[model samples]
Target: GPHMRDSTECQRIIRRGVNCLMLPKGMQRSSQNRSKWDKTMDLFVWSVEWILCPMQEKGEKKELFKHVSHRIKETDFLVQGMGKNVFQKCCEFYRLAGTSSCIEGEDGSETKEERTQILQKSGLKFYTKTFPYNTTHIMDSKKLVELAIHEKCIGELLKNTTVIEFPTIFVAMTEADLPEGYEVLHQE
Candidate 1:
């Protein structure tokens, strides 16, 4: 369909707090950030502290959508920081998670090499350093599962609607480097 408004008119409408519907397929996916859709969805859902019930109050207006987008931007920063920390911890864990020792048979104990192949097949990798701690407190598997679920929902929603875009600009901005002397933080 041909647009009735020009670029300037569209900008003006946006400035005046007009919201446009963006269905799911309308969003474009980038190869560089293939796994980012889930994270963005999580941020979007978290942006709305309270869901408006049309029966109790009017449904969300255009301004509310704008506000949610802004909130997602804020949430991205915190999630990125946390993700880095978790990645570091995962690396550390893989380095020192565990080792396997062989039991003595009637003849002799098996070599580490024999056990290593078995472990590797089972998705275990050995490291030179011994495990420093019994457990890692950095990565929370439960939270990660929840995040995955949220991301799946985002995918489903996109399949159903056209009111949202993937790799939202706010998310992209949050991941960018901030200017020096600009110390700001977001909290929900």
Candidate 2:
């Protein structure tokens, strides 16, 4: 990387890592709001993900009668981030499929016989099945930014950041200007 240190591609890649904004799929943004000076630098594909755990129920569960209501699987998706809005929309999309009851619905009197019976009528056979599920956990970009600030890495970052305008070494760290609790454990 010595010779290519000042290349635009290198700067962008390093900046993206330092910036640490992950974007999900299908929510990409255009360069409509760039400052022109750094317009090109503002674009990159960020690997972002959203995760959900389904609660198979048709309605909200009540805390007054807390129970292990639904046993379901996880749903994961990638984002084509359109900045912060994707976080909110992801939550909205999660609401409709957030929870559902067993295939037997909420009728406790329903028997295992009823479960197999319903599926059999629907042209499938299973010992048991849950109804469609719902998931509601959401993430926000604000918190990620907050966390980055909380890391207190700016002192270290600034010390290493001028590489874009200079050259760097195929090197490891020395404690020379490193901060506490952030010593390099390994390098290649």
Candidate 3:
């Protein structure tokens, strides 16, 4: 009896959340133009049954459900922005990799032509692993961007030091605004 009562009560509560035009009665009362009316009702019911079902909760579970729902919403927002920015940056890096010239004559023994040839051979091998031209490399670009965004978001939320130091620090430093002896280390 308790199960039956709960099922009926859940149906009643769920019906309140559905659009009035989606009810079976609305479809029945649509007169001779029942095609679109039935289709709309079908879509509405499907939406409620599929999309809204897992999203709904009752009794003591409502607060936990709301908390998860809020987090999902926030993560969706963060992901959209971060994914787009990363895609853009990956494209930029790919373009930059194309025009980049290699450094030659590090040992100072070879002529310019010899150095250029040496660099051309070695540079080709180096870039084969460096740029995100292939599928795996593209995935690496996405991974880096995701990590950067995640770290930035976490640093902002927790008020902690970031590996990249906030973007503002670079701007300030470029303006000769950094403190003395603050050497920007190239290594991580």
Candidate 4:
């Protein structure tokens, strides 16, 4: 396969973005003045935000792929105050979103060990976290299902968590770093 333009550059930046998104609280330090902690974190957040802005637009995933491809090849200045980890996290998040599947409410009724088995059988990535959440925070399919049911019964219910997936075509530019049991199909 032909190599992508600025592929390594994109990979480093994307990896940095992904790593930043995965870190838990309390990692940042001011050495004294804590104002910089939130500042630094937000800086990374904003960078990742730009990376994800395309996902929020029309045309869904295709829009994202086009955006990333164009952005990297035509414009690195658009990255602004970006970091490598932040980009990578966005990449990972997208990948996770693509393979996600919701379990039935009936399936949610199970023990933690049972849940693990269910996820394994369902073909979920074994050692990866879903987007916008810490890896250490285990997913509660039962709670998610309960919330889903409540939302149907009550219109006012709001969900704090959601599952998603995406492709690596634009983010990694070469389909590298794709986890096992995950895939992307470039079909028109």
In terms of TM-score, how similar is model 4 to the real structure?
A: 0.17
Q: How many clashing residue pairs, candidate 2?
A: 15
Tell me each candidate's TM-score: 0.17, 0.17, 0.14, 0.17
Model 1 error, position 58 (Å): 15
- State residue 11's C-alpha deviation in candidate 1, in Å: 14
lDDT of 3 by residue, 1-188 (tens): 11122211211111212111212222222221111113422321111000000112233221110001111111122222223333233323222122223245243323223322422332211100011222111111111111232223322321221111011111110212222333332225
Where does candidate 1 have its weakest 10-residue lDDT segment? Answer: 138-147
Residue pairs with backbone atoms closer than 3 Å in model 3 (clashes): none
Summarize candidate 4's per-residue lDDT along 1-188 as a digit string, tens digits: 32232311212112222321122222221111111113423331221122231223223333332222211211122222223444345545444222223444434333323323332333332111223433322222311111121112111111222222111112322222332244443325
Question: Which residue pairs in model 1 clash with each other?
Answer: 22-162, 22-163, 22-164, 23-161, 23-162, 23-163, 24-161, 24-162
> Which tens-of-lDDT digit does each residue in 1-188 have in candidate 1?
32232221212111112122222222222111122214534433212111111111134322111111222232232222223333233334334243345554522224323333332433421111011122221111111001121123332322322221122211111111222232223235
User: What tens-digit string does per-residue lDDT give for candidate 2 at 131-182?
Assistant: 1112122122111101121122322322222212111111101222222232
